[PDB]
Design a protein around this ligand. Structure first.
Ligand code: HEM
Ligand code: HEM
Ligand code: A1BTV
Ligand code: A1BTV
Ligand code: H4B
Ligand code: H4B
Ligand code: CA
Ligand code: CA
Ligand code: CL
Ligand code: CL
Ligand code: GD
Ligand code: GD
Ligand code: ZN
Lengths: 403, 403
């Protein structure tokens, strides 16, 4: 098993959990592809994954080898024999979603993994009911700014019927209007979904923070457009505690990060629509979403406004402006009473998570490049922590866009 | 051939050079160990490495397979048959030193790889001569602050003979002293080598920045304790352009990063003593050396002096203090006319190096976790650049401590 060192403390662990990694990553002894954004790209195989999952379930409740464990294994085996697939028990779906979060190598927020509200929407039958489920998710999770982690699980993939899909990458996203100059007004990460919304009859705005409609896909159905009720979309105007002109930038962000395009895989079953939400780490907004050159790209405007020497790199004008933007985000969310965590607190809690998981399971799949925050990397403890990246199931997986 | 994307620009390249990776890294399809600091830990073997290097060499000078190529190959064959090793020609040594730097996946400064002064010390004998070679290295490389990359190559390992070894990890290091107060005065990274110099007759100081003596090891002799003439060790007292109290913290650092504990491998030959130097990237000093919790750990000291609110993480007092420490580093080296590069300029140049290397040989081994700076990660272009990590030879490799 790989030896894993913390270089801040000298402490040494061994990741015995990685030996159990089923699905393969992109690395080989010849070359490491750890930095790649996309690393990854029927009866007996399903049973192997199902059996393994049921084993995980009954371990988590300290009833391994029990009568109930054996009977449930036999029950899954019989259903897979009769139908080629099976249904999770409610309890299993809840456990499976929590495990999928727990297994997500790129999530720094996994200290929370046991605190997850699971909405079972597996009886959903239309895009309209999907919209209702989504609105209930948003209302619950937002909780008027006291954010609560939740996942809504729509029906699993099954042969002979199309998937449920939420086309939007997140439930709340700002329009990106591909301006004609090749530029973008709004969020450039959302130019494609924005144009698909327009294609499907949405009347666009012209702002930088226009909330997109939902394109909800029921099985074998073109996507259907649904407008989120404004009262359900909590937003935070950005201001800075000491730079009063900052508020005149007219920047905003939304309260609720609710990822809606990943596939949830539990015991070999696949849920292509299972949006999940937590709360933001402030660097996601302050550093990536606002300061990435290919996103809102506000770094230079702020630095110029702060009167920084932007003609020379060595003045660290980029670093100084980014810090103040991150300050504005944290200050603004706290002022709005919307849950948010800074990258220092998040990474400190992740270190506690790693320690819990070493005790609980003998390791923790972690993607160092994604866990270390995009600013102040070595100022956080995770920078100094060696990490082992591997794929466990249940899992949140990337999947092709449905168009 | 791995596809490699830049996510800021969307451009795609294919790393065809990774296919030539000679050694095996720690990663497998089951688990990625790319974040590990220590990834790595007979005549037919030596010959096959020697041959491949000679082929590399003659290919790079467009003497592909010519008459000289065939004669050099036969020379090394007879040498190894006669002696068990062989001797590099001076130009092969220069070529091999440059390629070992060029191949170093964790070096962000490789845009400079074609410019390296190679001091051939292979005739060295006795630690006394080592010291002279090292002093001439330090003097040449420092160049009154106009730093110039240089390597001094001491005699290679060979059968039955000892090794030349520089016990110090760098030619310039500050001492670290412990107490039954528990803490360390000076650099905690150098506590081991500091007690060794003391155990070898050096009488210690009591300062935070006591430059260490050199512990040089001729083959099969005890290490000999040499003192660097203080006018050879150019240092930069650290001050801040606007925070006038920063100078009163008494911080300083040295001009010349000269790494003296890595092993240089060329053509199956191993040079355990081959110190190389360049110049610093500012984050190495201002972020890692001064702000790492297990190094000088000054961040809270600086934040207190900046009157920052250190009781909550969300004030980003750590980020603001780090930025000003990096400012002080850049300002102090520039005012002292000592070569230094900030992390924005260095990562921008590494992007240019990536493009040059894509053209030169179809790719470039790069370790994302080490190329991305330890502050302002995503504010630099390398953050958004997927990278392939692999081991090429000639190479610089870690090696066990002599003791
Ligand atoms: C409770 C507070 C949470 C915080 C602060 C948090 C934080 C984060 C952050 C900062 C990322 C990286 C996102 C990016 O850079 O694009 C991430 C990734 C991720 N999070 Fe969490 N998270 C939280 C809750 C959750 C929940 C409730 C789930 C699912 C039930 C989840 C699942 C994931 C997954 C699967 C990823 C990886 C996404 C990818 O690979 O692209 N997280 N998390
Ligand atoms: C000329 C200016 C140079 C700059 C600005 C530079 C910058 C850097 C930096 C910032 C690192 C990371 C080191 C750390 O974080 O501890 C590094 C690593 C490295 N550099 Fe460069 N470097 C330069 C020249 C050179 C030269 C001349 C050589 C050898 C001839 C070299 C060989 C290496 C190697 C082997 C590593 C990897 C060290 C390791 O794996 O531990 N570099 N460089
Ligand atoms: N898809 C593309 N790129 C692309 C690929 C991957 C990603 C990953 C972005 N994850 C969003 C995300 C994920 C996880 C967490 C957050 N935040 C949060 N705190 C939370 N949410 C939910 C619970 S916590 C946010 C983003 C973009 C393509 N672009 C062009 C052609 S393909
Ligand atoms: N040695 C230990 N860890 C350890 C392992 C690896 C490293 C890598 C750092 N190499 C120093 C270094 C290397 C390369 C570049 C720099 N900077 C520079 N700009 C230059 N130099 C020379 C030319 S450019 C500095 C550091 C520490 C251990 N600690 C405890 C038990 S083992
Ligand atoms: C190329 C690189 O993998 C890519 O830019 C990654 C790096 N680390 C990241 N880390 C997080 N949390 N989110 C990201 O989008 C990225 N992007
Ligand atoms: C654990 C982790 O690999 C380790 O802290 C690495 C991360 N990236 C780094 N990057 C650089 N340039 N130098 C380092 O020492 C490290 N340390
Ligand atoms: Ca049933
Ligand atoms: Ca005592
Ligand atoms: Cl986001
Ligand atoms: Cl250093
Ligand atoms: Gd003000
Ligand atoms: Gd004061
Ligand atoms: Zn890897």
């Amino acid at each position: 098993f790989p030896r894993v060192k913390n270089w801040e403390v000298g402490s040494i662990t061994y990741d015995t959990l990685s030996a159990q990694a089923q699905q393969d990553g992109p690395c080989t002894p010849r070359r490491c592809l750890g930095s790649l954004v996309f690393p990854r790209k029927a009866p007996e195989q399903l049973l192997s994954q199902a059996r393994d999952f049921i084993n995980q379930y009954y371990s988590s409740i300290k009833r391994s080898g029990s009568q109930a464990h054996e009977q449930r294994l036999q029950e899954v085996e019989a259903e897979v024999a009769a139908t080629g697939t099976y249904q999770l028990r409610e309890s299993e779906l809840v456990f499976g979603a929590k495990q999928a979060w727990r297994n997500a190598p790129r999530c720094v927020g996994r200290i929370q993994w046991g605190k997850l509200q699971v909405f079972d929407a597996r009886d959903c039958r239309s895009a309209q009911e999907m919209f209702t489920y989504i609105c209930n998710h948003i209302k619950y999770a937002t909780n008027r700014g006291n954010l609560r982690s939740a996942i809504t699980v729509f029906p699993q993939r099954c042969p002979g019927r199309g998937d449920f899909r939420i086309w939007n990458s997140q439930l709340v996203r700002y329009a990106g209007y591909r301006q004609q100059d090749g530029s973008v007004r709004g969020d450039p990460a959302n130019v494609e979904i924005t144009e698909l919304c327009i294609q499907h009859g949405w009347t666009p705005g012209n702002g930088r923070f226009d909330v997109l409609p939902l394109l909800l896909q029921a099985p074998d159905e073109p996507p259907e457009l649904f407008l989120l009720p404004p009262e359900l979309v909590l937003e935070v105007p950005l201001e800075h505690p000491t730079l009063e002109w900052f508020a005149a930038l007219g920047l905003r962000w939304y309260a609720l990060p609710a990822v809606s395009n990943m596939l949830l895989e539990i015991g070999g079953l696949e849920f292509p629509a299972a949006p999940f939400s937590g709360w933001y780490m402030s660097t996601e907004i302050g550093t990536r979403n606002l300061c990435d050159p290919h996103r809102y790209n506000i770094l230079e405007d702020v630095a110029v406004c702060m009167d920084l020497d932007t003609r020379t790199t060595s003045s660290l004008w980029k670093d100084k402006a980014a810090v103040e933007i991150n300050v504005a985000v944290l200050h603004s969310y706290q002022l709005a009473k919307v849950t948010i965590v800074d990258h220092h607190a998040a990474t400190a809690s992740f270190m506690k998570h790693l320690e819990n998981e070493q005790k609980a399971r003998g390791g923790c799949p972690a993607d160092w490049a994604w866990i270390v925050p995009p600013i102040s990397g070595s100022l956080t403890p995770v920078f100094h922590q060696e990490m082992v990246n591997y794929f466990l199931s249940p899992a949140f997986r990337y999947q092709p866009d449905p168009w």
